[PDB]
PDB file of C-alpha atoms and ligand atoms in Angstrom:
ATOM      1  CA  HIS F   1     -14.218-224.431  35.186  1.00  0.00           C
ATOM      2  CA  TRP F   2     -15.484-223.306  31.782  1.00  0.00           C
ATOM      3  CA  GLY F   3     -18.695-224.791  30.264  1.00  0.00           C
ATOM      4  CA  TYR F   4     -21.923-223.749  28.565  1.00  0.00           C
ATOM      5  CA  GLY F   5     -23.932-222.535  31.492  1.00  0.00           C
ATOM      6  CA  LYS F   6     -25.128-219.157  32.661  1.00  0.00           C
ATOM      7  CA  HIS F   7     -22.150-218.555  34.753  1.00  0.00           C
ATOM      8  CA  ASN F   8     -19.310-220.284  32.858  1.00  0.00           C
ATOM      9  CA  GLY F   9     -20.503-220.235  29.266  1.00  0.00           C
ATOM     10  CA  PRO F  10     -18.914-218.660  26.143  1.00  0.00           C
ATOM     11  CA  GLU F  11     -19.346-215.093  27.299  1.00  0.00           C
ATOM     12  CA  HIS F  12     -17.195-215.783  30.361  1.00  0.00           C
ATOM     13  CA  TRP F  13     -14.366-217.675  28.576  1.00  0.00           C
ATOM     14  CA  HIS F  14     -12.228-214.632  27.903  1.00  0.00           C
ATOM     15  CA  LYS F  15     -11.497-214.156  31.644  1.00  0.00           C
ATOM     16  CA  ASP F  16      -9.509-217.378  31.665  1.00  0.00           C
ATOM     17  CA  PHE F  17      -8.634-217.554  27.935  1.00  0.00           C
ATOM     18  CA  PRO F  18      -8.035-213.948  26.797  1.00  0.00           C
ATOM     19  CA  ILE F  19      -7.484-215.179  23.145  1.00  0.00           C
ATOM     20  CA  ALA F  20     -11.295-215.565  23.154  1.00  0.00           C
ATOM     21  CA  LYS F  21     -11.253-211.972  21.929  1.00  0.00           C
ATOM     22  CA  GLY F  22      -8.474-212.566  19.394  1.00  0.00           C
ATOM     23  CA  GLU F  23      -8.169-211.928  15.683  1.00  0.00           C
ATOM     24  CA  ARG F  24      -9.004-215.366  14.273  1.00  0.00           C
ATOM     25  CA  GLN F  25     -11.647-216.868  16.539  1.00  0.00           C
ATOM     26  CA  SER F  26     -14.146-219.492  15.534  1.00  0.00           C
ATOM     27  CA  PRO F  27     -16.925-220.266  14.759  1.00  0.00           C
ATOM     28  CA  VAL F  28     -18.128-217.569  12.333  1.00  0.00           C
ATOM     29  CA  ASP F  29     -21.205-216.841  10.249  1.00  0.00           C
ATOM     30  CA  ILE F  30     -20.596-217.789   6.697  1.00  0.00           C
ATOM     31  CA  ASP F  31     -22.206-215.068   4.533  1.00  0.00           C
ATOM     32  CA  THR F  32     -22.576-217.052   1.391  1.00  0.00           C
ATOM     33  CA  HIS F  33     -22.846-213.960  -0.851  1.00  0.00           C
ATOM     34  CA  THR F  34     -19.560-212.459   0.543  1.00  0.00           C
ATOM     35  CA  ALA F  35     -17.533-215.640   0.392  1.00  0.00           C
ATOM     36  CA  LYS F  36     -15.282-215.600  -2.668  1.00  0.00           C
ATOM     37  CA  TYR F  37     -15.029-218.474  -5.017  1.00  0.00           C
ATOM     38  CA  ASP F  38     -11.309-219.441  -5.290  1.00  0.00           C
ATOM     39  CA  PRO F  39     -10.774-221.443  -8.506  1.00  0.00           C
ATOM     40  CA  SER F  40      -7.196-222.321  -7.237  1.00  0.00           C
ATOM     41  CA  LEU F  41      -8.688-224.285  -4.403  1.00  0.00           C
ATOM     42  CA  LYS F  42      -8.175-227.967  -4.891  1.00  0.00           C
ATOM     43  CA  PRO F  43     -10.756-230.706  -4.214  1.00  0.00           C
ATOM     44  CA  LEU F  44     -10.530-232.070  -0.762  1.00  0.00           C
ATOM     45  CA  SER F  45      -8.834-235.500  -0.458  1.00  0.00           C
ATOM     46  CA  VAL F  46     -10.425-237.515   2.332  1.00  0.00           C
ATOM     47  CA  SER F  47      -8.568-240.840   2.765  1.00  0.00           C
ATOM     48  CA  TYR F  48     -10.394-242.704   5.551  1.00  0.00           C
ATOM     49  CA  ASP F  49     -10.241-246.293   4.245  1.00  0.00           C
ATOM     50  CA  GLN F  50      -7.599-247.413   6.776  1.00  0.00           C
ATOM     51  CA  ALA F  51      -9.074-245.513   9.739  1.00  0.00           C
ATOM     52  CA  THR F  52      -8.721-247.179  13.133  1.00  0.00           C
ATOM     53  CA  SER F  53     -11.268-245.940  15.729  1.00  0.00           C
ATOM     54  CA  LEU F  54     -10.389-246.847  19.288  1.00  0.00           C
ATOM     55  CA  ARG F  55     -12.679-245.439  21.832  1.00  0.00           C
ATOM     56  CA  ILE F  56     -15.503-243.049  22.606  1.00  0.00           C
ATOM     57  CA  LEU F  57     -15.219-240.667  25.552  1.00  0.00           C
ATOM     58  CA  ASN F  58     -17.555-238.292  27.404  1.00  0.00           C
ATOM     59  CA  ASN F  59     -15.234-235.445  28.368  1.00  0.00           C
ATOM     60  CA  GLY F  60     -17.849-233.271  30.012  1.00  0.00           C
ATOM     61  CA  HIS F  61     -18.309-230.956  27.054  1.00  0.00           C
ATOM     62  CA  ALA F  62     -19.010-233.366  24.224  1.00  0.00           C
ATOM     63  CA  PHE F  63     -18.197-236.938  23.226  1.00  0.00           C
ATOM     64  CA  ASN F  64     -15.062-237.750  21.253  1.00  0.00           C
ATOM     65  CA  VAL F  65     -14.562-240.744  19.039  1.00  0.00           C
ATOM     66  CA  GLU F  66     -10.792-241.154  19.116  1.00  0.00           C
ATOM     67  CA  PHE F  67      -8.590-242.717  16.343  1.00  0.00           C
ATOM     68  CA  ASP F  68      -5.069-244.209  16.152  1.00  0.00           C
ATOM     69  CA  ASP F  69      -3.111-241.238  14.781  1.00  0.00           C
ATOM     70  CA  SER F  70       0.383-242.899  15.147  1.00  0.00           C
ATOM     71  CA  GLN F  71       0.503-243.614  11.378  1.00  0.00           C
ATOM     72  CA  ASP F  72      -1.046-242.135   8.178  1.00  0.00           C
ATOM     73  CA  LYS F  73      -4.279-244.217   8.383  1.00  0.00           C
ATOM     74  CA  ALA F  74      -7.059-241.587   8.121  1.00  0.00           C
ATOM     75  CA  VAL F  75      -5.789-238.411   6.521  1.00  0.00           C
ATOM     76  CA  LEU F  76      -7.076-235.170   5.012  1.00  0.00           C
ATOM     77  CA  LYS F  77      -5.124-233.488   2.270  1.00  0.00           C
ATOM     78  CA  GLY F  78      -5.734-231.215  -0.677  1.00  0.00           C
ATOM     79  CA  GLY F  79      -8.251-228.412  -0.518  1.00  0.00           C
ATOM     80  CA  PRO F  80      -6.551-225.373   1.048  1.00  0.00           C
ATOM     81  CA  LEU F  81      -4.029-227.505   2.932  1.00  0.00           C
ATOM     82  CA  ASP F  82      -0.364-228.016   2.272  1.00  0.00           C
ATOM     83  CA  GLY F  83       0.743-231.424   3.546  1.00  0.00           C
ATOM     84  CA  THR F  84      -1.001-234.280   5.252  1.00  0.00           C
ATOM     85  CA  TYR F  85      -3.248-234.004   8.277  1.00  0.00           C
ATOM     86  CA  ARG F  86      -4.081-237.026  10.436  1.00  0.00           C
ATOM     87  CA  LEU F  87      -7.472-237.722  11.926  1.00  0.00           C
ATOM     88  CA  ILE F  88      -7.351-237.788  15.702  1.00  0.00           C
ATOM     89  CA  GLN F  89     -10.907-237.573  16.835  1.00  0.00           C
ATOM     90  CA  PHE F  90     -14.349-236.431  15.891  1.00  0.00           C
ATOM     91  CA  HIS F  91     -17.087-234.882  18.041  1.00  0.00           C
ATOM     92  CA  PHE F  92     -20.263-232.908  17.689  1.00  0.00           C
ATOM     93  CA  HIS F  93     -21.915-229.730  19.040  1.00  0.00           C
ATOM     94  CA  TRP F  94     -25.693-229.838  19.310  1.00  0.00           C
ATOM     95  CA  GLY F  95     -28.776-227.974  20.629  1.00  0.00           C
ATOM     96  CA  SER F  96     -31.605-228.454  23.006  1.00  0.00           C
ATOM     97  CA  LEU F  97     -33.969-227.761  20.035  1.00  0.00           C
ATOM     98  CA  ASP F  98     -33.730-228.764  16.377  1.00  0.00           C
ATOM     99  CA  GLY F  99     -33.461-225.073  15.393  1.00  0.00           C
ATOM    100  CA  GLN F 100     -30.058-224.554  17.035  1.00  0.00           C
ATOM    101  CA  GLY F 101     -26.884-226.461  17.858  1.00  0.00           C
ATOM    102  CA  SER F 102     -24.360-225.691  15.114  1.00  0.00           C
ATOM    103  CA  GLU F 103     -21.374-223.436  15.726  1.00  0.00           C
ATOM    104  CA  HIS F 104     -20.896-222.148  12.253  1.00  0.00           C
ATOM    105  CA  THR F 105     -23.947-220.621  10.703  1.00  0.00           C
ATOM    106  CA  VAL F 106     -24.797-220.112   7.000  1.00  0.00           C
ATOM    107  CA  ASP F 107     -26.426-216.759   6.253  1.00  0.00           C
ATOM    108  CA  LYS F 108     -27.305-216.721  10.000  1.00  0.00           C
ATOM    109  CA  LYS F 109     -29.007-220.120   9.727  1.00  0.00           C
ATOM    110  CA  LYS F 110     -28.311-222.470  12.580  1.00  0.00           C
ATOM    111  CA  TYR F 111     -28.311-226.202  12.061  1.00  0.00           C
ATOM    112  CA  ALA F 112     -29.385-228.825  14.615  1.00  0.00           C
ATOM    113  CA  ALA F 113     -25.758-229.894  15.159  1.00  0.00           C
ATOM    114  CA  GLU F 114     -22.312-229.770  13.732  1.00  0.00           C
ATOM    115  CA  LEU F 115     -19.756-232.512  13.341  1.00  0.00           C
ATOM    116  CA  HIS F 116     -16.030-231.711  13.761  1.00  0.00           C
ATOM    117  CA  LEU F 117     -13.478-234.173  12.273  1.00  0.00           C
ATOM    118  CA  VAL F 118     -10.278-233.035  13.866  1.00  0.00           C
ATOM    119  CA  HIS F 119      -6.910-233.536  11.977  1.00  0.00           C
ATOM    120  CA  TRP F 120      -3.347-232.427  12.791  1.00  0.00           C
ATOM    121  CA  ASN F 121      -0.528-231.523  10.457  1.00  0.00           C
ATOM    122  CA  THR F 122       2.052-234.339  10.449  1.00  0.00           C
ATOM    123  CA  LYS F 123       4.956-231.978   9.993  1.00  0.00           C
ATOM    124  CA  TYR F 124       4.583-231.050  13.648  1.00  0.00           C
ATOM    125  CA  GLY F 125       4.938-234.596  14.904  1.00  0.00           C
ATOM    126  CA  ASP F 126       2.033-234.683  17.457  1.00  0.00           C
ATOM    127  CA  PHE F 127      -1.251-232.971  18.230  1.00  0.00           C
ATOM    128  CA  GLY F 128       0.185-231.079  21.154  1.00  0.00           C
ATOM    129  CA  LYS F 129       2.844-229.445  18.952  1.00  0.00           C
ATOM    130  CA  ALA F 130       0.332-228.853  16.163  1.00  0.00           C
ATOM    131  CA  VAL F 131      -2.001-226.734  18.222  1.00  0.00           C
ATOM    132  CA  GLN F 132       0.760-224.289  18.866  1.00  0.00           C
ATOM    133  CA  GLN F 133       1.091-223.504  15.139  1.00  0.00           C
ATOM    134  CA  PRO F 134      -1.116-221.296  12.912  1.00  0.00           C
ATOM    135  CA  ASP F 135      -1.459-224.241  10.404  1.00  0.00           C
ATOM    136  CA  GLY F 136      -1.388-227.003  12.946  1.00  0.00           C
ATOM    137  CA  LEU F 137      -4.915-228.323  12.611  1.00  0.00           C
ATOM    138  CA  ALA F 138      -7.577-228.867   9.871  1.00  0.00           C
ATOM    139  CA  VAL F 139     -11.072-229.344  11.173  1.00  0.00           C
ATOM    140  CA  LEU F 140     -13.660-230.619   8.755  1.00  0.00           C
ATOM    141  CA  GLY F 141     -17.012-229.342   9.818  1.00  0.00           C
ATOM    142  CA  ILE F 142     -20.233-230.908   8.610  1.00  0.00           C
ATOM    143  CA  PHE F 143     -23.730-229.565   9.463  1.00  0.00           C
ATOM    144  CA  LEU F 144     -26.514-231.877  10.694  1.00  0.00           C
ATOM    145  CA  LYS F 145     -30.152-231.176   9.839  1.00  0.00           C
ATOM    146  CA  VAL F 146     -33.058-233.197  11.233  1.00  0.00           C
ATOM    147  CA  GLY F 147     -34.865-235.347   8.614  1.00  0.00           C
ATOM    148  CA  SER F 148     -34.076-238.850   7.494  1.00  0.00           C
ATOM    149  CA  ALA F 149     -31.775-240.994   9.647  1.00  0.00           C
ATOM    150  CA  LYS F 150     -28.079-241.290   8.883  1.00  0.00           C
ATOM    151  CA  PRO F 151     -27.314-244.997   8.968  1.00  0.00           C
ATOM    152  CA  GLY F 152     -23.648-244.456   9.506  1.00  0.00           C
ATOM    153  CA  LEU F 153     -24.343-242.434  12.662  1.00  0.00           C
ATOM    154  CA  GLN F 154     -26.377-245.156  14.419  1.00  0.00           C
ATOM    155  CA  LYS F 155     -23.408-247.090  15.941  1.00  0.00           C
ATOM    156  CA  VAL F 156     -22.402-243.857  17.653  1.00  0.00           C
ATOM    157  CA  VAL F 157     -25.980-243.283  18.836  1.00  0.00           C
ATOM    158  CA  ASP F 158     -26.307-246.762  20.232  1.00  0.00           C
ATOM    159  CA  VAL F 159     -23.152-246.577  22.420  1.00  0.00           C
ATOM    160  CA  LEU F 160     -24.089-243.262  24.137  1.00  0.00           C
ATOM    161  CA  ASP F 161     -25.899-245.090  26.948  1.00  0.00           C
ATOM    162  CA  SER F 162     -22.549-246.472  27.976  1.00  0.00           C
ATOM    163  CA  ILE F 163     -20.845-243.031  28.292  1.00  0.00           C
ATOM    164  CA  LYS F 164     -23.666-240.984  29.797  1.00  0.00           C
ATOM    165  CA  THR F 165     -21.591-238.985  32.264  1.00  0.00           C
ATOM    166  CA  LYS F 166     -18.356-237.102  32.365  1.00  0.00           C
ATOM    167  CA  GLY F 167     -15.184-239.279  32.363  1.00  0.00           C
ATOM    168  CA  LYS F 168     -16.842-242.452  31.012  1.00  0.00           C
ATOM    169  CA  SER F 169     -15.291-244.135  28.028  1.00  0.00           C
ATOM    170  CA  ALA F 170     -16.057-247.178  25.933  1.00  0.00           C
ATOM    171  CA  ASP F 171     -14.268-249.316  23.428  1.00  0.00           C
ATOM    172  CA  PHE F 172     -15.325-248.163  19.995  1.00  0.00           C
ATOM    173  CA  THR F 173     -13.364-250.085  17.293  1.00  0.00           C
ATOM    174  CA  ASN F 174     -14.087-250.545  13.598  1.00  0.00           C
ATOM    175  CA  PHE F 175     -16.161-247.417  13.154  1.00  0.00           C
ATOM    176  CA  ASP F 176     -15.946-246.037   9.602  1.00  0.00           C
ATOM    177  CA  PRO F 177     -16.157-242.255   9.599  1.00  0.00           C
ATOM    178  CA  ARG F 178     -16.914-242.317   5.873  1.00  0.00           C
ATOM    179  CA  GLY F 179     -20.528-243.072   6.900  1.00  0.00           C
ATOM    180  CA  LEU F 180     -20.823-239.521   8.238  1.00  0.00           C
ATOM    181  CA  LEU F 181     -19.916-237.687   5.022  1.00  0.00           C
ATOM    182  CA  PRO F 182     -22.420-235.981   2.681  1.00  0.00           C
ATOM    183  CA  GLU F 183     -22.305-236.677  -1.091  1.00  0.00           C
ATOM    184  CA  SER F 184     -20.529-233.422  -2.054  1.00  0.00           C
ATOM    185  CA  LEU F 185     -17.152-232.255  -0.700  1.00  0.00           C
ATOM    186  CA  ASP F 186     -17.844-228.616  -1.781  1.00  0.00           C
ATOM    187  CA  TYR F 187     -16.559-226.461   1.069  1.00  0.00           C
ATOM    188  CA  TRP F 188     -15.936-223.007   2.497  1.00  0.00           C
ATOM    189  CA  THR F 189     -12.573-222.401   4.230  1.00  0.00           C
ATOM    190  CA  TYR F 190     -11.095-219.747   6.500  1.00  0.00           C
ATOM    191  CA  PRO F 191      -8.377-219.421   9.226  1.00  0.00           C
ATOM    192  CA  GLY F 192      -9.762-219.856  12.693  1.00  0.00           C
ATOM    193  CA  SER F 193      -9.500-221.316  16.143  1.00  0.00           C
ATOM    194  CA  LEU F 194     -10.524-224.102  18.437  1.00  0.00           C
ATOM    195  CA  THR F 195     -14.194-223.394  19.406  1.00  0.00           C
ATOM    196  CA  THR F 196     -13.558-224.620  23.030  1.00  0.00           C
ATOM    197  CA  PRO F 197     -10.917-223.465  25.476  1.00  0.00           C
ATOM    198  CA  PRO F 198      -8.032-223.135  24.990  1.00  0.00           C
ATOM    199  CA  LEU F 199      -9.388-221.461  21.886  1.00  0.00           C
ATOM    200  CA  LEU F 200      -5.998-221.604  20.120  1.00  0.00           C
ATOM    201  CA  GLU F 201      -5.640-219.995  16.789  1.00  0.00           C
ATOM    202  CA  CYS F 202      -4.400-223.039  14.975  1.00  0.00           C
ATOM    203  CA  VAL F 203      -7.164-224.318  12.764  1.00  0.00           C
ATOM    204  CA  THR F 204      -7.759-224.206   8.984  1.00  0.00           C
ATOM    205  CA  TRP F 205     -11.489-224.570   8.941  1.00  0.00           C
ATOM    206  CA  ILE F 206     -13.028-226.532   6.130  1.00  0.00           C
ATOM    207  CA  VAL F 207     -16.827-226.399   6.357  1.00  0.00           C
ATOM    208  CA  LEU F 208     -18.830-228.520   3.980  1.00  0.00           C
ATOM    209  CA  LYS F 209     -21.700-226.884   1.988  1.00  0.00           C
ATOM    210  CA  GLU F 210     -23.928-229.980   2.083  1.00  0.00           C
ATOM    211  CA  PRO F 211     -25.394-230.996   5.470  1.00  0.00           C
ATOM    212  CA  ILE F 212     -26.093-234.573   6.453  1.00  0.00           C
ATOM    213  CA  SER F 213     -29.539-235.519   7.543  1.00  0.00           C
ATOM    214  CA  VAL F 214     -29.978-237.323  10.846  1.00  0.00           C
ATOM    215  CA  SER F 215     -33.310-238.425  12.421  1.00  0.00           C
ATOM    216  CA  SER F 216     -35.109-236.751  15.300  1.00  0.00           C
ATOM    217  CA  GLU F 217     -34.470-239.916  17.361  1.00  0.00           C
ATOM    218  CA  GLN F 218     -30.760-239.785  16.641  1.00  0.00           C
ATOM    219  CA  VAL F 219     -30.324-236.244  17.930  1.00  0.00           C
ATOM    220  CA  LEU F 220     -32.645-236.906  20.871  1.00  0.00           C
ATOM    221  CA  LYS F 221     -30.140-239.481  21.984  1.00  0.00           C
ATOM    222  CA  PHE F 222     -27.376-236.812  21.981  1.00  0.00           C
ATOM    223  CA  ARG F 223     -29.541-234.798  24.323  1.00  0.00           C
ATOM    224  CA  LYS F 224     -29.691-237.573  26.920  1.00  0.00           C
ATOM    225  CA  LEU F 225     -25.992-237.321  27.680  1.00  0.00           C
ATOM    226  CA  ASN F 226     -24.841-235.460  30.804  1.00  0.00           C
ATOM    227  CA  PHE F 227     -22.216-232.706  31.288  1.00  0.00           C
ATOM    228  CA  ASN F 228     -21.836-233.896  35.032  1.00  0.00           C
ATOM    229  CA  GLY F 229     -20.072-236.897  36.287  1.00  0.00           C
ATOM    230  CA  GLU F 230     -21.849-239.856  37.809  1.00  0.00           C
ATOM    231  CA  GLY F 231     -23.220-239.130  41.229  1.00  0.00           C
ATOM    232  CA  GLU F 232     -23.319-235.349  40.535  1.00  0.00           C
ATOM    233  CA  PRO F 233     -26.524-233.383  39.842  1.00  0.00           C
ATOM    234  CA  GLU F 234     -27.682-234.067  36.266  1.00  0.00           C
ATOM    235  CA  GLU F 235     -27.291-231.421  33.603  1.00  0.00           C
ATOM    236  CA  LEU F 236     -28.249-232.548  30.212  1.00  0.00           C
ATOM    237  CA  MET F 237     -25.506-232.132  27.688  1.00  0.00           C
ATOM    238  CA  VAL F 238     -27.247-229.729  25.324  1.00  0.00           C
ATOM    239  CA  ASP F 239     -26.386-226.420  23.733  1.00  0.00           C
ATOM    240  CA  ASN F 240     -22.656-227.156  23.804  1.00  0.00           C
ATOM    241  CA  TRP F 241     -21.985-224.721  21.035  1.00  0.00           C
ATOM    242  CA  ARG F 242     -20.123-221.426  20.875  1.00  0.00           C
ATOM    243  CA  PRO F 243     -21.907-218.685  19.014  1.00  0.00           C
ATOM    244  CA  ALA F 244     -20.514-216.986  15.938  1.00  0.00           C
ATOM    245  CA  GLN F 245     -17.533-214.670  16.586  1.00  0.00           C
ATOM    246  CA  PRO F 246     -16.487-211.617  14.675  1.00  0.00           C
ATOM    247  CA  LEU F 247     -14.851-212.245  11.294  1.00  0.00           C
ATOM    248  CA  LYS F 248     -12.412-209.318  11.685  1.00  0.00           C
ATOM    249  CA  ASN F 249      -9.752-209.194   9.003  1.00  0.00           C
ATOM    250  CA  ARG F 250     -10.572-212.554   7.381  1.00  0.00           C
ATOM    251  CA  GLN F 251     -12.086-213.714   3.971  1.00  0.00           C
ATOM    252  CA  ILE F 252     -14.070-216.887   3.644  1.00  0.00           C
ATOM    253  CA  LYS F 253     -13.207-218.663   0.445  1.00  0.00           C
ATOM    254  CA  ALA F 254     -15.501-221.103  -1.385  1.00  0.00           C
ATOM    255  CA  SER F 255     -14.362-224.017  -3.606  1.00  0.00           C
ATOM    256  CA  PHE F 256     -17.536-223.739  -5.650  1.00  0.00           C
ATOM    257  CA  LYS F 257     -19.821-221.164  -7.241  1.00  0.00           C
TER     258      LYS F 257
HETATM  259  N1  N7S J   1     -14.468-227.753  18.557  1.00  0.00           N
HETATM  260  S1  N7S J   1     -12.986-227.824  17.728  1.00  0.00           S
HETATM  261  O1  N7S J   1     -12.640-226.367  17.282  1.00  0.00           O
HETATM  262  O2  N7S J   1     -13.185-228.843  16.499  1.00  0.00           O
HETATM  263  C1  N7S J   1     -11.701-228.495  18.722  1.00  0.00           C
HETATM  264  C2  N7S J   1     -10.844-229.324  18.202  1.00  0.00           C
HETATM  265  C3  N7S J   1      -9.850-229.858  18.857  1.00  0.00           C
HETATM  266  C4  N7S J   1      -9.693-229.527  20.187  1.00  0.00           C
HETATM  267  O3  N7S J   1      -8.617-230.046  20.940  1.00  0.00           O
HETATM  268  C5  N7S J   1     -10.635-228.618  20.706  1.00  0.00           C
HETATM  269  N2  N7S J   1     -10.462-228.134  22.133  1.00  0.00           N
HETATM  270  C6  N7S J   1     -10.297-229.034  23.192  1.00  0.00           C
HETATM  271  O4  N7S J   1     -10.161-230.211  23.060  1.00  0.00           O
HETATM  272  N3  N7S J   1     -10.297-228.385  24.515  1.00  0.00           N
HETATM  273  C7  N7S J   1     -10.033-229.040  25.818  1.00  0.00           C
HETATM  274  C8  N7S J   1     -11.145-229.885  26.286  1.00  0.00           C
HETATM  275  C9  N7S J   1     -10.889-231.378  26.060  1.00  0.00           C
HETATM  276  C10 N7S J   1     -10.381-232.100  27.282  1.00  0.00           C
HETATM  277  O5  N7S J   1     -11.434-232.728  27.861  1.00  0.00           O
HETATM  278  C11 N7S J   1     -11.575-228.078  20.038  1.00  0.00           C
HETATM  279 ZN1   ZN J   2     -15.881-228.837  17.880  1.00  0.00          ZN
END
């Protein structure tokens, strides 16, 4: 099965998922001088006031905080998107060291981690249909740098002891994802893919310019999770990021100068 090790990591994925070598793969390096400011880009509309978090799950590759997506409760609109996209889950990718962990890079700079708020286009009816469409998902990507703590992340950090190993889940209600957002919603955007298998080319990526700061203790607690299931040999869940992929025939657009 695929993963992030020496024998099943990102350089192996194409053998089971040939789209790994496709034309719109993610993540990418964001060359800030080559991105083009698009003044027609609209401000992002993040409407998370009615969000209903349900549960947090260790799936063996990351942890997902899952939301009720059966109504328009937490939606992303505007920006480059047409229509309404519903929040289904968020998760992170992170490193073994503070100098690495993000999937996207900014002028080759790697951040300590990257948050992915995953949304699907309501015109396709459900997430499974949406991932089969070139405009099916919108993933809002937010970089994490190590510095001051992020208070809105702490409820996530504190529950991780309950989901240490693959397949463990915990109730996780009343979590407000607005506590994970930076001040500015300035963003870069480009067409891309899921960054884990099945690597489907269904994502409008929206990557925020401004990182959030989290404390060293917060990211340390991410690194105590396990890729393995309970009663299996312990592999720390670290470096669960795919490196930057070729940009090919794509232009990254910026909502700001
Ligand atoms: N990193 S991402 O581009 O924001 C991303 C957003 C939504 C996704 O569905 C995936 N891929 C995925 O879930 N693959 C199957 C493993 C889960 C079952 O345990 C990746
Ligand atoms: Zn992700």
